[PDB]
Amino acid sequence: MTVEYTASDLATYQNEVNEQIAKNKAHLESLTHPGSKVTFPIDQPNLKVFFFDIDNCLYKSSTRIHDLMQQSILRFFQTHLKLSPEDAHVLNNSYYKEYGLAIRGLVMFHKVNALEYNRLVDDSLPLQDILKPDIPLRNMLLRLRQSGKIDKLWLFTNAYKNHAIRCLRLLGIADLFDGLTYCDYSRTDTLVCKPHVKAFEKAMKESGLARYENAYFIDDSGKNIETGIKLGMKTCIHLVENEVGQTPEGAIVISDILELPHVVSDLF
Ligand SMILES: [Cl-]
Ligand SMILES: [Cl-]
Ligand code: NA
Numbered sequence: 568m569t570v571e572y573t574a575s576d577l578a579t580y581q582n583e584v585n586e587q588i589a590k591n592k593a594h595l596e597s598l599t600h601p602g603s604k605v606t607f608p609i610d611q612p613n614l615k616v617f618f619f620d621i622d623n624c625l626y627k628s629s630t631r632i633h634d635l636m637q638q639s640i641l642r643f644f645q646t647h648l649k650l651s652p653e654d655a656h657v658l659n660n661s662y663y664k665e666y667g668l669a670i671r672g673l674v675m676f677h678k679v680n681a682l683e684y685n686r687l688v689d690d691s692l693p694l695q696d697i698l699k700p701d702i703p704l705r706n707m708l709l710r711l712r713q714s715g716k717i718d719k720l721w722l723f724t725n726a727y728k729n730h731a732i733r734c735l736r737l738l739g740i741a742d743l744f745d746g747l748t749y750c751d752y753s754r755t756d757t758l759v760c761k762p763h764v765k766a767f768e769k770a771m772k773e774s775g776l777a778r779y780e781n782a783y784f785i786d787d788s789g790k791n792i793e794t795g796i797k798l799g800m801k802t803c804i805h806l807v808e809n810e811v812g813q814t815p816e817g818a819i820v821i822s823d824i825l826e827l828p829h830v831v832s833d834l835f
Contacts (some may be wrong), residue, residue: 568645577646584691594695595736602654602705602739605732607746616776617711617834618723618795619744620761621734623664624806624824625704628787629697631719636663639688645833649678662688665788666725667760674756681752686726694730700739708743711761717783719745721774725760727752749775762790767798783834785824792818802831 595603619625637659644655654673657834661669673679712720720743724731728749735741748770750760759765776782779799786792786805789812796817797805804827805818814820819830828835 570693574722580646580687584687587691587693588686590692591690591693592694594693595733598736600699600739602741602743603736604741605735606742607744609728609732609747610822611746611773613781614718614776614783615635615716616721616774617783618721618748618770618774618785620806621722621731622666622726622768622789622792623742623787623808624785625734625738625750626698626701628808630692631697633663635692635696636688637690643684645687647679654678654774666730667752667758668725668729668762668767671760674752674758677756681756681758685730685752689727689730694710694733695737698734698737699738701793702739703825704738705740705743707828708740708834710828712743713834719774721745721770722747722749723761723766723770724748724788725750725766728734746774759787760795762788764794764798765792769818783831785821785827787794789815789818804830 591696611815640655640658644650652671657688658669670679670681670684674681708720711717722731722735722744724747724751728747731747731749734739735744750758752758759769771779780801782790782795784795784800784803786795787807792803792805793815796812803818805814805820806822806824807814807820808822810822821827821830
């Protein structure tokens with residue numbers, strides 16, 4: 568939109584975002600529950616690694632998050648003339664599912680500054696209004712961790728690291744993983760993200776996995792699962808919460824991450 572008070576408006580939007588981010592951080596600082604702090608470093612034999620997508624996987628897809636994200640994108644759209652209405656419409660449908668992949672084209676063609684977008688749209692979101700400590704989840708992941716069958720639980724996400732970290736802390740599962748592979752929005756206009764092969768190569772390198780046959784993978788994106796299968800991962804699990812992209816042949820199909828011990832019980 569072309570407005571009367573452009574400068575005062577953008578400052579106001581940025582100032583509101585500043586205040587909300589400060590509140591978001593203060594909230595995290597207040598947490599004292601198990602799993603409320605990251606216990607692994609960032610950007611660091613027959614090793615077995617289980618890779619986990621985060622969004623819509625470690626928590627159930629939320630229309631509240633979709634709606635909050637849409638409102639956020641709407642405010643961004645109104646203030647950034649480089650985005651078309653179709654760009655914004657597609658983001659409304661896709662960003663809260665695909666994260667970095669959803670902005671990859673926009674970033675490559677310089678219609679969106681990734682860090683600016685992440686701050687105003689993503690880091691601004693009061694995720695604590697939706698994501699709460701999940702004890703059954705914690706207990707399931709701990710069960711996997713302690714079973715003696717898997718060496719590392721590794722996060723593998725298209726979100727930027729702070730979004731990913733917030734999710735782990737809010738859900739009370741931040742001490743259950745050994746590391747995090749995220750989509751780096753910071754200093755390239757060519758984002759590396761799933762389902763692209765280079766994202767998998769990054770996850771392999773960072774986790775220290777040597778052989779795809781020693782990898783396990785759970786994700787809600789059929790196409791991501793497909794890359795995993797074709798790379799030769801041992802078992803890929805396609806999470807489809809609502810059976811309303813297809814499931815690639817060879818994937819196990821589940822509707823809730825708590826189904827995991829009942830579909831790959833050998834690992835538990
Ligand atoms: Cl592209
Ligand atoms: Cl584009
Ligand atoms: Na996901």
